[PDB]
């Protein structure tokens, strides 16, 4: 994979250095329905007029971006997204801006969030969990090799495509950094203890998050939960983990190594890096090449109606998309 990654970095760097800009405009799309929301924006199902293709259009109010102090994070998101390429990363198809909004148009992944299916089904069996986990492992290997840290892993940000494979979305907290960084960001249940403790951290926080995701997929609930974020952080920092009775010995050993408070001992962060995870007994049945090639048969295939079907997504309250005749925050988002 060393020769693959070296070429992958070469491809990535060209686009990182000279980013795509202004590859569409709003009136090229008909907005249909909201697919999901986050603290500052919504993702809408749209239909592209000239092609007839459906896409997921992420809309960011520039004023809200600024208010929540997310200018650099939003610039990060777009710059990274337009430069990456991997089978399990949602593709950015177009991006643009107008007087009021930033727009990131992605491929529409109709199978819905892993979150919905996980909560509905209750929990995934270990092979089912392993199938998804493997894709995240390879994806993080790819991202980290590019000096990228992801920082927002959770079932809400993992979409199931028509083949039952994972598409990672939401690069809102993604950042290109060599060495450590300090921003307190992510989702409380998925925060590594070094994020909470404000001491600076590196890509090993993504591996901790992988442990949290694997646990939640396999248990049906997270390893650290409570009614309030501050209560969750207390449990994370204690580091005490308890496993369901049905967890295999192999799964528990892997999780102890991922949910490891000690950075000199956390899997993924050691001398042999990602190979400590890839070669773990829990992944013994995993053909890593077959996964990458999408040749492994998926355990779950979302019911797929029409190309613009949203039946795998919850309904959200709609809201008009406003565009002022006055340009807002022009200089701030010049590079977008």
């Amino acid at each position: 994979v060393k020769e693959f990654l070296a070429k992958a970095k070469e491809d990535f760097l060209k686009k990182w250095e000279t980013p795509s800009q202004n590859t569409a405009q709003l009136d090229q799309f008909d907005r249909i329905k909201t697919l999901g929301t986050g603290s500052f924006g919504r993702v809408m199902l749209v239909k592209h007029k000239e092609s007839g293709n459906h896409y997921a259009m992420k809309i960011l109010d520039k004023q809200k971006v600024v208010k929540l102090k997310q200018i650099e994070h939003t610039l990060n998101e777009k710059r990274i997204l337009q430069a990456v390429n991997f089978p399990f990363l949602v593709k950015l198809e177009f991006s643009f801006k107008d007087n009021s909004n930033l727009y990131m148009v992605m491929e529409y992944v109709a199978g819905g969030e892993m979150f919905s299916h996980l909560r509905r089904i209750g929990r995934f069996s270990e092979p089912h969990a392993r199938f998804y986990a493997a894709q995240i492992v390879l994806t993080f290997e790819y991202l980290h090799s590019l000096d990228l840290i992801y920082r927002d892993l959770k079932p809400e940000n993992l979409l199931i495509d028509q083949q039952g494979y994972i598409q990672v979305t939401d690069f809102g907290f993604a950042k290109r950094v060599k060495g450590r960084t300090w921003t307190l960001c992510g989702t409380p249940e998925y925060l590594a203890p070094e994020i909470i403790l404000s001491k600076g951290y590196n890509k090993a926080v993504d591996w901790w998050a992988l442990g949290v995701l694997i646990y939640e997929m396999a248990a049906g609930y997270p390893p650290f939960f409570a009614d309030q974020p501050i209560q969750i952080y207390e449990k994370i920092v204690s580091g005490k983990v308890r496993f369901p009775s049905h967890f295999s010995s192999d799964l528990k050993d892997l999780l102890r190594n991922l949910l490891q408070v000690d950075l000199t001992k956390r899997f993924g962060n050691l001398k042999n890096g990602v190979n400590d995870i890839k070669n773990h007994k829990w992944f013994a049945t995993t053909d890593w090449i077959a996964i990458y090639q999408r040749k492994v048969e998926a355990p779950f295939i979302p019911k797929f109606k029409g190309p613009g079907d949203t039946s795998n997504f919850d309904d959200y309250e709609e809201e008009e998309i406003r565009v002022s005749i006055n340009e807002k925050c022009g200089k701030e988002f010049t590079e977008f």
């Binding site: 999901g36 986050g38 603290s39 929540l68 102090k69 997310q70 994070h73 969030e113 979150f115 909560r119 927002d152 959770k154 809400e156 809102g172 907290f173 921003t183 307190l184 960001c185 992510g186 989702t187 409380p188 249940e189 248990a219 049906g220 609930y221 997270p222 939960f225 409570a226 009614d227 974020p229 308890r242 369901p244």
Partner: peptide, 20 residues
Amino acid sequence: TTYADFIASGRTGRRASIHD
């Protein structure tokens, strides 16, 4: 059970990310 305690908790829906 842990499952029951989770299901009765206030954080079983989609979880918001945090910044600052």
